[PDB]
Structure 1
Amino acid sequence: GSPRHTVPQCCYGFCIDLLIKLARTMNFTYEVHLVADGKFGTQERVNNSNKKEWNGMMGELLSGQADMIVAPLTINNERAQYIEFSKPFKYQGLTILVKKSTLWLLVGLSVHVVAVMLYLLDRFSPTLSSAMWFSWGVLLNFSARILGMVWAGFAMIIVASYTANLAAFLVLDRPEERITGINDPRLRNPSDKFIYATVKQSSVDIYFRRQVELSTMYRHMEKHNYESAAEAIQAVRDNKLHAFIWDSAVLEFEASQKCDLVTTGELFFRSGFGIGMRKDSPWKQNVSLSILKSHENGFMEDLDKTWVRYQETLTFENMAGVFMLVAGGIVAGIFLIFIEIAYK
């Protein structure tokens, strides 16, 4: 899209204020710049000479153009073989971003036929509209009175069964929009329905590439690798995605932003994110002691107060349409009452 258009703009947030705290702590100035891509950095064979190389922030740090990766970098085994690490500042796990009759007409025809032969039983027994409005009072609430009270028992037991199966329809049979983590059997053998994906060239892809027992998920997310997580948020807001493997507190902050964003139940791979560092350097011991000093006090709670800690029945399920139907039935019956005006 934009090959070479690099401008100075204003950056702020969590790690920016963390670096401001570090500059307040120690004896240094700094120079904040960005990375050329939206990728952490993966080890891949370059096409010439058959050699595995890196890219991204690891490719820019080892090239000497950078000095310190101040980013929530994924700590794993392969990165520590080449560079050194500090104490982690972030501690979080992994999660999934998701998005959150005719029989009555038969009973009506039955009570119409019941009313008809009750009117017939009134006729054969040694008046008309009185029995009509009496049936209008009965169905909703001397030989004909016995059938009327037996049918009133029928009416109460039918509306009791109606209450029972409406409660059954609203409590038990609920569609599971959640996934409950990796242990969903429909995601173990996926299809074109449940769209789960991840960031292109992310460390989660390498972490699942080491896990050879779920290689089918490795062959499924490769068809839907996105460049940035904002693309995944834009695609899941427009209902193009269905699931997204990502860290916990970032999706919790996005759930605080947008209430429709829901995390999953399973909390696995409880890992930590630290600051990307160089090799053996005089900025290792002092900086780690400063990070531990930031851990021991309530400055982590202050950084939570900046962004992390701060956040941003109804009885209208299916009776709003019934409410409109009642209003429309009253308006439609007003014309029949005009017919009753013209009749009398």
Structure 2
Amino acid sequence: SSAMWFSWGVLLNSGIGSFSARILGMVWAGFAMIIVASYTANLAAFLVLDRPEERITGINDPRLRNPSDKFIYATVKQSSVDIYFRRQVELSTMYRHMEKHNYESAAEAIQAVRDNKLHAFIWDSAVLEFEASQKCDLVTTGELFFRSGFGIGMRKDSPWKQNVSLSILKSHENGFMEDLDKTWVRYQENMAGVFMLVAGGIVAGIFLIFIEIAYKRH
């Protein structure tokens, strides 16, 4: 049993221990060092890999442009995003599949996405980033497209449009918008498993094997 213990100690480096035996040991050690070096290199190469799917760079990704049943994404309803998609006649093929996955409210669509019902959801950057900050299980992809702004909708006959614009400009100048953004929008196991398992196994074995050997000897 000593020979196989020494062989395992050579393979797994933990210090466990005529001419033909010596040369066999030389060859075994030279083989084992190469094997462990190659195994470490292979493990290092394997660990550096993007297991999750690549993040969506933007609208130019062919995955979004080409619709598929394995990856379904759509807007909420006939909102400004729907108007933007309708104006640009370039993605009707995915528009056909987008028309089949509408939702009553944006919150319902976000909840469905959290439940993995929808692979992706297209909506405003501010709402999506707020949801990502509040809910860590959701993330935002895509840099910027269809950039616009939020305005106070008023009818044409309203005579205070200029006053509203001046008030908005003054609020921006005074930093009120920054304060509101800070107050509202600007919010906040395998590795442990293996070590716990090996620690428990070793602390159990150091007693179990010893009592078994004592029983066998007795």
TM-score range for the pair, normalised by the shorter chain length: 0.7 to 0.9
**Structure 1 residue matching 2:128: 3-state secondary structure:** helix
Higher helix share: 2
Return the offset for 1:183: 1.8
The answer to whether the Cα contact below 8 Å between 1:251 and 1:263 also exists between their aligned partners in 2 is yes
**In 2, distance between residues paired with 1:340 and 1:145?**
34
- Normalization by structure 1: what TM-score? 0.56
Question: Structure 1's 175 and 259: CA in aligned 2 closer, same or farther, altered over 3 A?
Answer: closer
RMSD over aligned Cα, in angstroms? 2.4
State the secondary structure of the residue aligned to 1:272.
strand
Question: Once the 2 structures are TM-superposed, how far is the Cα of residue 219 of structure 1 from its aligned partner?
Answer: 0.8
- Mapped pair 1:153 → 2:30: yes
CA-CA distance at 1:265 after TM superposition: 3.1
Q: Residues 215, 330 of structure 1: CA spacing in aligned structure 2 closer, same or farther, 3 A cutoff?
A: same
Instruction: Give the equivalent residue in structure 1 for 2:8.
Output: 136
Assess if the C-alpha contact under 8 Å between 1:188 and 1:217 holds in 2.
Answer: yes
Shift of 1:319: 4.0
Aligned equivalents of 2:57 and 2:114: distance in 1? Answer: 20
Alignment check: 8 A CA contact 1:205 1:218 kept:
no
Task: List, as ranges, runs of 4+ consecutive aligned residues in structure 1 with deviation greater than 6 Å.
Answer: none
Tell me which residue corresponds to 1:318: 190
Tell me which moved more, 151-160 or 237-246: 151-160
The SS at the match of 1:263 is: strand
Greater relative contact order: 1 or 2 (C-alpha under 8 angstroms, separation 6 or more)? 1
Q: Kindly tell me: are residues 319 and 306 of structure 1, through their superposed partners in 2, closer, same or farther at Cα, counting changes over 3 Å? A: closer
Distance 1:153 1:265 in 2: 52
Please list the CA deviations of residues 24-82 of structure 1 after superposition, one character each: whole Å capped at 9, or x if unmatched.
Answer: xxxxxxxxxxxxxxxxxxxxxxxxxxxxxxxxxxxxxxxxxxxxxxxxxxxxxxxxxxx
Could you say if the C-alpha distance between residues 280 and 178 of structure 1 is closer, same or farther in structure 2, counting changes exceeding 3 Å? same
CA deviations on 1:249-290 (whole Å, 9 max, x unpaired) are 111111111112111132112211101011143212222111
CA displacement at 1:324 relative to structure 2:
5.1
How much has 1:321 moved relative to structure 2?
A: 4.5
Residues 189 and 216 in structure 1, CA contact (< 8 A), matched pair in contact too: yes
Check conservation: 2:134, 2:187, Cα contact below 8 A. Answer: no
Length-normalised TM-score, structure 2: 0.84
Aligned partners of 1:154, 1:207: CA distance in 2, in Å?
Answer: 65
User: What is the CA distance between 1:172 and its match in structure 2?
Assistant: 2.9
| TM superposition shift of 1:341 | 2.9
Change in Cα spacing, 1:253 to 1:173, as seen in structure 2 (3 Å) is closer
